[PDB]
Amino acid sequence: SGSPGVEQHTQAFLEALEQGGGKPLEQLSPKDARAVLTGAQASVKVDLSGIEVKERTIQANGQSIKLQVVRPANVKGELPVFMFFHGGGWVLGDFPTHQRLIRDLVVGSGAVAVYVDYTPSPESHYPTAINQAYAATQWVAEHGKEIGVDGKRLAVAGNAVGGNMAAVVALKAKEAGTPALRFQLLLWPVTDASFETASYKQFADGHFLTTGMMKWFWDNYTTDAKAREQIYASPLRASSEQLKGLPPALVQTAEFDVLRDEGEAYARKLNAAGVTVTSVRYNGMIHDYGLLNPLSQVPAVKAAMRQAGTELKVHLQLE
Amino acid sequence: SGSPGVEQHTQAFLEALEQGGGKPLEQLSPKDARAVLTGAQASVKVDLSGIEVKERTIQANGQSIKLQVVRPANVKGELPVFMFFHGGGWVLGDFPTHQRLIRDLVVGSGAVAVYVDYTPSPESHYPTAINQAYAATQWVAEHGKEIGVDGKRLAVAGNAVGGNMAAVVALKAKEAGTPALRFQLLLWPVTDASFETASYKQFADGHFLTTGMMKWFWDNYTTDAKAREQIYASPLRASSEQLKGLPPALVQTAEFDVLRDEGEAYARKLNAAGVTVTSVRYNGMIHDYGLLNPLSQVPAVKAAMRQAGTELKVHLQLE
Numbered sequence: 001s002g003s004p005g006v007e008q009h010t011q012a013f014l015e016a017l018e019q020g021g022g023k024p025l026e027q028l029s030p031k032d033a034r035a036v037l038t039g040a041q042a043s044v045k046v047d048l049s050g051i052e053v054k055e056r057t058i059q060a061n062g063q064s065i066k067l068q069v070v071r072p073a074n075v076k077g078e079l080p081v082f083m084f085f086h087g088g089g090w091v092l093g094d095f096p097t098h099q100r101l102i103r104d105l106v107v108g109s110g111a112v113a114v115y116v117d118y119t120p121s122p123e124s125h126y127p128t129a130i131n132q133a134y135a136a137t138q139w140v141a142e143h144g145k146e147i148g149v150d151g152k153r154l155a156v157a158g159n160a161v162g163g164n165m166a167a168v169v170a171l172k173a174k175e176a177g178t179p180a181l182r183f184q185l186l187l188w189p190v191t192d193a194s195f196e197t198a199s200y201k202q203f204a205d206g207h208f209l210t211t212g213m214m215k216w217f218w219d220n221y222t223t224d225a226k227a228r229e230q231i232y233a234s235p236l237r238a239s240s241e242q243l244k245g246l247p248p249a250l251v252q253t254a255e256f257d258v259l260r261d262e263g264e265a266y267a268r269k270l271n272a273a274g275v276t277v278t279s280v281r282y283n284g285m286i287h288d289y290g291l292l293n294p295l296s297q298v299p300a301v302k303a304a305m306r307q308a309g310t311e312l313k314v315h316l317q318l319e
Numbered sequence: 320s321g322s323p324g325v326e327q328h329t330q331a332f333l334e335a336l337e338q339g340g341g342k343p344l345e346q347l348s349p350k351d352a353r354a355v356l357t358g359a360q361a362s363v364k365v366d367l368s369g370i371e372v373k374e375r376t377i378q379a380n381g382q383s384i385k386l387q388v389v390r391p392a393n394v395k396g397e398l399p400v401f402m403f404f405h406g407g408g409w410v411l412g413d414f415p416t417h418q419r420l421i422r423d424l425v426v427g428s429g430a431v432a433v434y435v436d437y438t439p440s441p442e443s444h445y446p447t448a449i450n451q452a453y454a455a456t457q458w459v460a461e462h463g464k465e466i467g468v469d470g471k472r473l474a475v476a477g478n479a480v481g482g483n484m485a486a487v488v489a490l491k492a493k494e495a496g497t498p499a500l501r502f503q504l505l506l507w508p509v510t511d512a513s514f515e516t517a518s519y520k521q522f523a524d525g526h527f528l529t530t531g532m533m534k535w536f537w538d539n540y541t542t543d544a545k546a547r548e549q550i551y552a553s554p555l556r557a558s559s560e561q562l563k564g565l566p567p568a569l570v571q572t573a574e575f576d577v578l579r580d581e582g583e584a585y586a587r588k589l590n591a592a593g594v595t596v597t598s599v600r601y602n603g604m605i606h607d608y609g610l611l612n613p614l615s616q617v618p619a620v621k622a623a624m625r626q627a628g629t630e631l632k633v634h635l636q637l638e
C-alpha cells in the first residue's frame with residue numbers, strides 16, 4: 001500500500017484496497033474483472049451535471065459502431081469535438097465507468113466528446129479496436145454535422161490504453177492523410193509492450209495498477225509478438241520520421257505509475273520529431289487518478305482535470 | 320409563481336422560473352421542448368452512485384425496442400425487477416433526464432429497473448408507446464434471466480404519463496392474462512383525457528406543469544377522441560369490473576398538481592374494485608417533485624422517494 005510521496009487521499013485509498021484484499025484482478029474472468037471497475041466507480045457520489053448525452057450508431061469499418069456523444073448542456077451550434085477512447089487494459093471499461101472523467105473534460109473544454117464503444121478483449125484482439133477507433137474518428141470528421149459538431153475541429157483523447165488508442169489513431173490519421181486532427185490528449189498512456197522501464201520495476205505492486213495486470217492486459221489484447229512490435233500497438237517504437245507531423249500533444253503522467261516512463265519517453269520521441277508537446281508529471285498520483293471516482297475530488301486531480309479541459313479548449317478554437 | 324402552502328424550496332424554484340421567463344413550453348417545437356427538460360436536469364449536481372446501467376435491445380411488438388437495465392451495484396444473483404416508464408407528456412423525456420429518479424428507486428428498493436425507450440409523440444401516436452411498453456414487460460417476464468432478473472417478481476412504475484403507462488400496462492397484462500405483476504407504482508399519474516377537475520382549475524398556471532402543457536401533450540399523443548375514451552388512454556374511465564384483480568398500487572400525488580384529482584380518483588376507483596391501494600398526497604409539492612433534479616434534495620422529496628423505493632422492495636420479495 002503506497003510509497004512515500006503518495007498524495008494523502010490517494011494513499012488512504014491504497015491502504016483501503018489492501019485492507020480486505022481480494023484476488024489479483026488478473027486471476028478473474030473478464031466478466032468478473034469488468035464488475036470490479038463497475039462496482040468501484042459506482043461506490044461514490046460524483047458530479048455529472050452540465051452535460052447531455054445521446055447515443056448514435058454508425059456504419060464504418062464495414063461495421064456497426066456505437067457512439068456516446070457527450071455535449072455541454074444548453075449550447076446551440078456546431079461545437080468543436082474530441083474523440084474519447086476509454087482505458088481498462090482493453091479488457092475493462094465502457095462509457096458509464098468513464099463517464100465522470102468524460103464529463104469533466106467536456107464541461108472544462110466546452111467541446112463535445114464522442115465516446116467510441118470499441119470491442120473489448122479478449123472478445124476481439126488487436127487491431128480490431130483501433131480500426132474501429134480510427135473509423136469512428138474519420139466518420140465524425142466527415143459527418144459531424146449529423147451530431148451537431150464541427151468535424152474540422154477535431155481532437156483525440158483518452159486514458160491508459162485509451163491514451164494508447166488516441167496516440168495510434170493520430171498515427172493512423174497521419175498515415176492515411178486524413179482526417180485533420182487539432183490535438184491529441186494522452187492521459188497516462190500505454191505506449192510500449194515492454195515491461196522493463198524503471199517505473200515498471202519501481203511500482204510493480206501496491207499502486208493499484210500492477211505489472212501483473214499490465215501483462216495480462218496485453219496478453220488479452222494480443223499474444224502475437226510481431227503485432228506488439230508494430231507502431232500501431234507500441235507507438236514508442238516509432239521513428240522520428242514516422243512521428244513527424246503529428247498533432248500537438250498534452251501528455252499527463254502519474255509519478256507512481258508503471259506506465260510513467262514509457263509515457264514520458266513517447267513525449268520525448270514526439271519532441272525529437274519536431275511535434276509540439278507538453279509533458280507534465282503529476283507527482284503523488286497513481287495510475288488513473290483522473291478516472292477513479294473515489295479520487296475525483298482530490299485537489300491535485302481537479303487541477304489535472306482543469307488543465308486537460310483547458311488545453312482541449314485552446315486547440316479547438318475557430319481559425 | 321406558486322400558492323400559499325408550497326414547500327419553501329419548491330416555491331423558490333417556481334419564482335426563479337417566472338424570473339427571466341421564456342415562451343410557454345407548448346409554443347416550442349418538440350425538439351426544442353425536449354432541450355428544455357434536458358437542460359434543466361443537467362443544471363444541477365445530483366447523486367447517481369450505487370447503480371450499474373447496461374443497454375439491451377429486444378425484439379418484441381414486431382419491433383426493436385431499446386432497454387436501459389439499471390441494477391444495484393455489486394449484487395450477484397437474479398434480482399426482482401420493475402419496469403420503468405418515463406414521463407414528459409409523451410413528447411418529452413428519455414433515460415438521462417429520468418436517470419436520477421430511477422437511480423433513487425433502484426438503490427432504495429434493491430430491485431432492478433428496466434427503462435423502456437418507447438417512441439415519442441408526435442413521431443408516433445397512441446397506442447404505439449403503450450404497445451411497446453406492454454411488449455417489453457412481457458419480454459422481461461419471459462426472458463429476464465438474460466438480463467439477470469427474476470421475471471416472475473415483476474412490477475411496473477412511472478411518473479406522469481409514465482404513470483399513465485404503468486397503469487395501462489397493468490390493464491393490458493390483466494386483459495391478456497399475462498404476465499403476473501406484483502405491484503404498480505404510480506407517481507403523480509395522468510389518468511384521464513379531461514381537463515375539468517378542481518385541481519386542473521386551481522393550478523392551471525404557475526406551478527410548472529400547466530393546463531396548456533397538458534392539452535398540448537395529449538394533442539401530440541392523439542387527437543382521436545375515440546382513442547382518448549379508451550381505458551388504455553384514459554384509465555379513469557374503466558369500470559369496477561375492468562379494474563378488478565389489478566395488482567397492488569402505491570399512488571403518490573402532489574398537492575399543487577393539475578393531475579392531482581384524477582390521480583386520487585383513479586386510486587378511489589381501484590379501491591372500489593377491491594384492488595389493494597395506498598393513496599398518498601404529498602402536500603407542498605408540485606408535479607414531478609420526484610423527477611426535477613433541482614428539487615432532488617428537498618426533504619419532502621427525499622421522504623417520498625424513500626417511500627417509493629421501500630414499497631417496491633416490500634412487493635418484490637421471495638414467496
Ligand SMILES: CC(=O)O[C@H](C(=O)O)c1ccccc1Cl
Nearest residue numbers: 182248249276277314315316317
Ligand atoms: C495555436 C494554438 O494552438 O495555441 C497553442 C498554445 O497557446 O499553447 C499553441 C499550439 C501549438 C503551437 C504553439 C501554440 Cl502557442
Ligand SMILES: CC(=O)O[C@H](C(=O)O)c1ccccc1Cl
Nearest residue numbers: 501567568595596633634635636
Ligand atoms: C403481502 C405483501 O405484499 O405485503 C404488503 C404490505 O405489507 O403492505 C401487502 C400487500 C397487499 C396486501 C396486504 C399486504 Cl400486508
